[PDB]
């Protein structure tokens, strides 16, 4: 169990695997995204529109995360490179 | 078969590659088009 423990690891830390997990779920938030603003909405929003707002405040929290976690050292500066990247 | 419609016929053949990048990226558009204005000019839509 050691082994199979060890590559399912090796393969969910891997970068190309960690690109096509967030891409296959980009490609599934933004189906959902399109659902919800096809269809009408009622008062309260339905579970798509739920799980597209989670998608959208845990990206700004990985967002902000990227900011702290930068190469500088001040605040400023943290933020001044990662505007450098307009993505 | 022909000297000069054959060579023409795997060159369109050729430029089929470039042809279906450019429809990605045709449709990327389009559908950001389409998508958003359907949205706006149709807000009360059944699922259909
Ligand atoms: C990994 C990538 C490439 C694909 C993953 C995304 C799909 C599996 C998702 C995205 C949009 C989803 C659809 C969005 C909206 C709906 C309507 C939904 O219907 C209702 O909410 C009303 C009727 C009912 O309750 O069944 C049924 C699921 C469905 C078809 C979803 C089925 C699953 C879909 C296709
Ligand atoms: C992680 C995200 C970005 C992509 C992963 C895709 C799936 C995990 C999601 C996408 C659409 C979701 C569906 C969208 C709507 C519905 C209808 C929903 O129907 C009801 O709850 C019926 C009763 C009611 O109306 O309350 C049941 C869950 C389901 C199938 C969802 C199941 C989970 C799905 C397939
Ligand atoms: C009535 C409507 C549906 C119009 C039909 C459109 C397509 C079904 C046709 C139109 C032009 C055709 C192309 C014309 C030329 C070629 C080159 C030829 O390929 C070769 O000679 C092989 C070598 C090479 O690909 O360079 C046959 C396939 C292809 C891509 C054809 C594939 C089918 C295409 C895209
Ligand atoms: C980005 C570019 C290069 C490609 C994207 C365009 C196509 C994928 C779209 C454009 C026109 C679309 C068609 C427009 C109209 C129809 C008729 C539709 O049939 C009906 O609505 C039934 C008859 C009726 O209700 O009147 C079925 C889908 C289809 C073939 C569509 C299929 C998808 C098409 C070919
Ligand atoms: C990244 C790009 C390529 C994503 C593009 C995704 C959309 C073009 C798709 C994905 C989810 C699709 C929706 C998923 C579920 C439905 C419900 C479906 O409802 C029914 O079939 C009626 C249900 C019944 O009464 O049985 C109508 C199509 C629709 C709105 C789909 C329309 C087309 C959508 C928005
Ligand atoms: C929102 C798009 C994305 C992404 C996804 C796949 C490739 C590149 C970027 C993400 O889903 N989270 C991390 N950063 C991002 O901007």
Redesign the interface.
Known sequence: LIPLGRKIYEFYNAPIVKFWFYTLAYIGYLMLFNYIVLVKMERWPSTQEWIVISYIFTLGIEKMREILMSEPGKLLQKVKVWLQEYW | VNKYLGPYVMMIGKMMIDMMYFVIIMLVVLMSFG?AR??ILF?????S
């Not at chain 2, 807000?43 to 699922?47: L, R, V, Y």
């Open positions: 998508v359907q949205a807000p009360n839509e059944e699922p």
